[PDB]
Design a protein around this ligand. Structure first.
Ligand SMILES: O=C(O)Cc1csc2ccc(Cl)cc12
Ligand SMILES: O=C(O)Cc1csc2ccc(Cl)cc12
Lengths: 329, 329
């Protein structure tokens, strides 16, 4: 039922958006069909982890028949707002590595996907008292993500270098770039639609979102480097891109002067042998052993904070538990 | 006083945004100074026609000393919201024609400039009852502009060609791509802050914005083709880019079969002689003569609609008159 409901609401949102363009924005059929296809290509095909989390939080916060169906429908629209926001970031990422009409159309896609999050909210929640708070929290999270993208993209530089290759800075990147929109926003949106936002300790929730985000990114960084492309589903480029990865920051705290010198001379290069030298350094430093322990300690902290949350918000803690299970898998 | 006030409020908005990043978003000084410079580079140096229009509308809608200073301050924040929105579109346009950290930073700039319009509104208008309506009208205008950009960029194609080279389609492009954010939005924002939105006939106002936008774009299209780069302040590329320009649509309605064939074989090419052949065709078709008459007829329509607006909204009509004078110049 969650996925079937989420897909039914997608059809409803899509039809509203496309009919609105046709009827109110003077759009010709050819462009309407082009936007239908673009929306499908960018918004469908994923696991819908962010979107489905909104639904799971709302269902749990049942602790009137008209109120239930409304809360679940609202959870679905909120879920598609995040899925469209994710679709917008991925398009922006695709421009970041690609009279060129394809580049013009990609920038346009980026702008429409973001505008669509506002359009679907302004319509489906038009009479809801939470509309203003929802829009403000969503916009603030969107800004946070762009800020996180700045921290990430400039980690190996000085915007106006391994100085920012620290665990505390790695955590700042993860929090802003990933954790706020991937873990915190779905949880918060599920709380907003349920009208149960002040009934939860936001501090413990924020802390949980940051911890789950960190667990996910450390695993993502390790997989980027060691999981082969056929198993990973993409080509891992963190070494070549000189990313501030969990592997790089952990390696620098335990490598010798000569090993650090060897790491510095081989990091951030496309050359196959330099990338392999970095992989060799990570392996020889027993980073895979340190990976297991780091993740286990984060897992212990997550498991503990859910209990503190369950003391005042029991239903919410079970939805945070399922969100965690999706990450820990 | 308007420009001095507008610049004073810029310093105030900038300081709030940058202090917020430092204090609430964990930003390091190096990145704060980098964003201060980027904000200055992208947001300052223009004529501030959109921003100053908001101020001019609010001053006029004076037909309590605490209310005046608030309305004028609000007009300034709204003006900077549009100037930042304009800055965001220009950055997006710069990406449209340019491990590349400059492209990553340009995309990031685009995203921050837009997010800043929301951040400054959410702060300065936090307790205002118009905040929700202002955000919704601004977001709807932003979407309209992205839609207009789609109509523009794909005018010479079929997104899934001279069929869309018509006066009615030219007007659809101008309305969505330019008129809504350049002429309608500054007028509407000046009305919102003054709490005088329902006291005006929106139909006549929308019609005026569309007409002024059209007058401006026809002149812009003619200047792009005939005004030399040292006088224009840029290199005119409409012919090379095969734009749906006022010159192209007017030429196609009056050219002979052989001349249309000659236009079709030479339009949309970078080759210097093909561009010159297009310029020769426009000249020989007496498009400069038709330009004068087209603009004069639009001017007559503008002058007439301001009178209808003055019947119910006198102060507003004088601000629409000054906005027109800035375009007619
Ligand atoms: O869905 C994604 O894009 C990434 C992802 C992989 S496991 C997991 C668990 C929870 C959330 Cl919110 C996201 C993810
Ligand atoms: O300011 C710009 O970017 C373009 C422009 C030139 S004359 C004029 C008059 C009114 C408005 Cl709103 C804009 C313009």
């Amino acid at each position: 039922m969650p996925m079937q409901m989420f897909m039914q609401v997608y059809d409803e949102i899509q039809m509203f958006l496309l009919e609105e363009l046709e009827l109110k924005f003077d759009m010709d059929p050819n462009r309407v069909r082009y936007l239908r296809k673009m929306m499908d290509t960018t918004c469908l095909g994923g696991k819908y982890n962010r979107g489905l989390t909104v639904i799971d939080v709302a269902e749990s916060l049942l602790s009137d028949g008209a109120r239930r169906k409304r809360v679940l429908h609202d959870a679905c629209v909120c879920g598609w707002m995040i899925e469209f926001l994710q679709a917008h970031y991925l398009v922006e990422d695709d421009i970041m590595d690609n009279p060129d009409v394809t580049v013009q159309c990609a920038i346009n896609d980026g702008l429409l996907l973001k505008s669509w999050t506002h359009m679907m909210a302004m319509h489906f929640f038009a009479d809801r008292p939470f509309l203003q708070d929802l829009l403000c929290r969503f916009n603030r999270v969107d800004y946070t993500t762009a800020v996180g993208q700045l921290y990430d993209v400039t980690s190996m530089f000085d915007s106006n270098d391994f100085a920012e290759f620290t665990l505390s800075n790695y955590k700042r990147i993860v929090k802003y770039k990933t954790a706020y929109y991937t873990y915190l926003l779905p949880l918060v949106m599920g709380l907003i639609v349920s009208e149960a936002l002040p009934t939860v300790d936001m501090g413990v929730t924020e802390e949980l979102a940051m911890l789950m985000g960190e667990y996910f990114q450390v695993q993502d960084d390790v997989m980027d480097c060691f999981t082969p492309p056929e198993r990973l589903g993409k080509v891992g480029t963190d070494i070549q891109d000189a990313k501030c990865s969990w592997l790089a920051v952990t390696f620098l705290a335990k490598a010798s002067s000569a090993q650090v010198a060897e790491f510095k001379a081989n990091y951030g290069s496309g050359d196959s042998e330099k990338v392999a030298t970095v992989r060799r350094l990570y392996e020889e430093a027993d980073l895979q052993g340190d990976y297991v322990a780091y993740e286990a300690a984060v897992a212990e902290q997550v498991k503990e904070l859910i209990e503190k949350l369950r003391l005042c918000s029991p239903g919410f803690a079970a939805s945070v538990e399922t969100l965690w299970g999706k990450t820990y898998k």
